[PDB]
Design a binder for this molecule. Sequence first.
Ligand SMILES: O=C(O)CCn1cnc2ccccc21
Length: 167
Amino acid sequence: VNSFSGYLKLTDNVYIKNADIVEEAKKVKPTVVVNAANVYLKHGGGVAGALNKATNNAMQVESDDYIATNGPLKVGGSCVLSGHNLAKHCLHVVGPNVNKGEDIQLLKSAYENFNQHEVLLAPLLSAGIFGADPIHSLRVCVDTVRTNVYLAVFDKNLYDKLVSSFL
Ligand SMILES: O=C(O)CCn1cnc2ccccc21
């Protein structure tokens, strides 16, 4: 049993809810929250900007030190950093950004990072400001992630479309 409440069950391991991931993290304090990161860990907008704002910019300060030491992530890659006030850990995962021309086949590689963690609170990778087809992103999640993932969909309208269209 875990603390996640109000989710619709899509599969054995994937759950979904219309929720603000920031407000969900603050309530649950999950072991792992996933950030929709870029390779520079520049948390300007979208999910990343919202998570970072909720940490009072401490996520960005920590991230800048990580990049200064290690250099940029790979598209499809990840790193584990603090979850600050939101979670124990933040898994920063880089999905491909269609608005930068990145290979959508890298979305599966991105979701494979989730398999290193038994339970996660996450957004749909590569959706919204990154531009990828959201139904395709949920499909890749279901067909890639084997650990238990609780998806926070920000767009209510989108939430209802993801559920209604789910195969
Ligand atoms: O709803 C999500 O969580 C996914 C990212 N996203 C946010 N607003 C959106 C509006 C349209 C499509 C995706 C959108």
